[PDB]
Design a protein around this ligand. Structure first.
Ligand SMILES: O=P(O)(O)OC[C@H](O)CO
Lengths: 513, 513
């Protein structure tokens, strides 16, 4: 009858976008608004939730305005999905509806005491003691730890639970809270898998863990799926509520990294998405039973397309300096200028010729988690130019990743089928060819730029009937939104000798205080 | 009454220089002639002995001609001295006087196999097996090894030997051959030392080793002192006998690193010379009685003034790179553009932030004899930059010097008086600054640049009465030279710090193969 449109709120660390998709999953309108990165102490990071909510209302308000001008058939939105930076926690109150403090951000560290004050004590020295319930280790990321701090370092939050009005929520929950007026106080499985209070298997809260780490089982929202009806957009803030002419529902909510997988069409095990930037998140779809890991990797919910639908779980890995290495090799090293001499230089040489550049500048994340590791280059000769090191950096991004892949294989019990890539170096043709061969699978690269925001846009489409099933979601993406593939092109006397080289080069990374 | 003059042929690796000196020990005429550096295969290097010879002659002409223009007083030269690249070995013929084939240089590596058969079949295990006669390990550099490679690889060599016509010698004996026309077939202590067929203390052709590696006695030149009669320039090539208005004697012959030792006023033990250009060697005056070493350090002659003079021995200790590291960082790495920016950027930062460069590009030389070692960098952070590297680079140099000095200080029996510098990077404040620091001594940077050439003239000038004694030669030099010095800076707070890095840094260098 009409042309359908699904909106998505991409809620990043630094910026929040609002993106409107028409039913061929085209991005037809975008508006981006950044927000202040308050850093009260070296190691601390927080944001203003009422700033974010505002930014979001700006993007929504503007993206809708812009589209309304260039598309004569756009006349409302079927549903809105939310995707968000994970692990960021907000404190607030049912009856004021304001927030009670600035939200400590995922990588924010004010909680490293409570990290230890939980391992040495409540863990008998084992951070993994709960790795079977939560699918997580103890660390400075998950919403439980950041709640502990607000309860023990802010009276305004300490007082508000004394009351029994205090509300916690990762950004999603918070965003749907204000967007609906205060009505829905709700969350999804992917975000919930990161709170440290949740139960990998059953995807219900952990009264056991809520207990121990002492967060009342009712300062918390409810755990819903990824794709259902969460609520309705009833908030007049900025233009937004007006700009939507009928009561527009929220029908999709999903942690961004999981949204990146889901938006990359990874609905089946083997498939994996990898987002680059300064650093990476490689998430592999692992199937219908939560898989656990020995390499201290993360277990988490990939997605759930409906209140009690087939719940696909996932493993997760990170490296910390990917595009940041490609940045350092410029901003700090003179080795090149434009992102185009870089890939001309690296191709100017056939191989690396015996050298290994381990960009372990913060140490090794990935599968080796070794803080004693440092940036280290071995086996240089006089024959070593700058144009080799730069290729050996492209190898390093691929090689490190391979370890994470390797790891996942061992802890999944299946082979990486293919890999999708986005938001890091999708222009860098060479990296994908050095990457594709090594892993031994097809590396797929999307032409369309907004997979992450499509992730949540597809959770809200489905649930509203913009696309019928996940099987029809593949075909639309198969026909409209192009990919070109990058296919393997190397052999063992390269593929397996490089993996040997890397590891021989790894014993030489150590370099602590 | 008119000014007394003396010549020194300074036949290097890349080029032949001829320099005329007056009694104020000042260079008054100079001429440079380069010669082709043939690399017939990878890791080979040879020169035409005739090219070299003709260059020596074209150098004498111009230097004899320029001198007239400049100071018309000039009628003749008192004596000639010769200084040369050591270990390069020339095959020639006592009849035809032509070279039978080319000449493998000191850094040429065609003598690998031979070395192995030598420490195998003849040596029987230890590379130090003849080191109580030759004062040297069994390796590629030394001249017997190159001698035999020629006996059993060139058709014209052994065939000219079957007739007994064959003649051998390093450049100094070779140049002193065609200068006379054949008349003289001599060599001095410093070059003979380097051959591996001479006893270190008795300066005779090692009767055992002679027949052991097979090199017939007469194929070997008479062994003289550094400072005496040798032959007469009875050659007519580019009219040297002609241009030398009178009959000119040869009263100086000495290897170039010892001549640059002797040209820097290091007549008493504990004083050391550090030279640049192709390579970098430290040589410290050990004393009148030879001090043998256990570390891979070369015991060698320092100098012998006349038949019946005191022979100070010394210890060597090679290091390939100096301005080589800098050229790599510049050329290969594009880390900067001009050698102006090296010291700039390196000074332009406080320190190395816990990195260490190891510019062991073609192995690790010095007292740590390790060929598997390659160029490495350890300890990098996202805050490390292109200048922290350039800083680290120049610190790896002196730290390496340190250990060779520590090897001597040990095996020699004394500490360190003073050390002087010459070559491409002697004009480098920071370099001698760190070296002054690390070693704990004064470092004199000398105004008269070309002091290697001085050495041989000094052997020609003492022998010919132009100068009377070294202490007088010290006083003469004093009446012309300016001490641009650098002294130590720091305690254990700074010294044992970057060293501590150094030790463990090095412990991560073994890579090759
Ligand atoms: O001529 P150089 O400056 O390359 O020095 C080479 C050494 O004398 C070889 O022992």
């Amino acid at each position: 009858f009409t042309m359908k449109y699904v909106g998505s709120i991409d809620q990043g660390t630094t910026s929040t976008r609002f993106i409107i998709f028409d039913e061929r999953q085209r991005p037809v309108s975008v508006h981006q608004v950044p927000h202040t990165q308050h850093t009260p102490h070296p190691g601390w990071l927080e944001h203003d939730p009422m700033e974010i909510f505002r930014s979001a209302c700006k993007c929504m308000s503007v993206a809708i305005a812009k589209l309304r001008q260039k598309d004569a058939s756009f006349r409302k939105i079927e549903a809105i999905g939310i995707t968000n930076q994970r692990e960021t926690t907000v404190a607030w109150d049912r009856v004021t509806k304001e927030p009670l403090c600035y939200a400590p951000v995922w990588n924010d560290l004010r909680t490293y005491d409570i990290t230890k004050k939980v391992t040495a004590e409540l863990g008998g020295g084992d951070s993994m003691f709960a790795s079977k319930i939560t699918g997580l280790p103890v660390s400075t990321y998950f919403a439980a730890f950041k709640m502990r701090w607000m309860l023990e370092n802010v009276p305004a939050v300490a007082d508000a639970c004394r009351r029994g009005t205090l509300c916690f929520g990762t950004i999603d929950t918070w965003l749907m809270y204000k967007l609906s007026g205060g009505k829905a106080f709700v969350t999804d499985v992917t975000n919930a898998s990161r709170t440290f209070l949740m139960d990998l298997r059953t995807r219900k809260w952990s009264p056991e863990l809520c207990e121990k780490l002492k967060i009342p089982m009712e300062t918390l929202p409810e755990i819903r799926s990824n794709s259902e009806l969460f609520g309705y957009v009833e908030t007049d803030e900025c233009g937004v509520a007006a700009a939507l002419n009928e009561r527009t529902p929220i029908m999709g909510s999903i942690g961004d990294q999981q949204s990146a997988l889901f938006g990359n069409m990874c609905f089946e095990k083997g498939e994996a998405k990898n987002t680059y930037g300064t650093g990476c998140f490689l998430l592999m779809n692992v199937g219908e039973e939560a898989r656990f890991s020995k390499h201290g990797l993360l277990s988490t919910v990939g997605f759930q397309v409906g209140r009690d639908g087939p719940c696909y779980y996932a493993l997760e890995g990170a490296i910390a300096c990917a595009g940041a290495t490609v940045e350092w090799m410029r901003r700090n090293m003179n080795l090149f200028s434009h992102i185009t001499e870089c890939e001309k230089l690296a191709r100017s040489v056939p191989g690396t010729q015996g050298i290994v550049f381990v960009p372990a500048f913060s140490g090794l994340l990935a599968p080796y988690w070794d803080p004693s590791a440092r940036g280290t280059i071995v086996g240089m000769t006089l024959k070593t130019t700058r144009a080799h090191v730069i290729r050996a950096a492209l190898q390093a991004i691929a090689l490190q990743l391979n370890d994470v892949v390797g790891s996942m294989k061992r802890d999944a019990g299946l082979n990486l089928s293919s890999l999708r890539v986005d938001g890091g170096l999708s222009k860098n043709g060479l990296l994908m060819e050095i990457q594709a061969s090594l892993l031994g699978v097809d590396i797929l690269v999307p032409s369309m730029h907004e997979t992450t925001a499509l992730g949540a846009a597809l959770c809200a489409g489905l649930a509203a009937g913009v696309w019928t099933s996940l099987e029809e979601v593949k075909a639309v993406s198969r026909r409209e939104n192009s990919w070109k593939t990058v296919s393997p092109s190397g052999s063992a006397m390269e593929r397996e000798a490089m993996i040997a080289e890397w590891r021989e080069a790894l014993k030489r990374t150590k370099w602590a205080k």
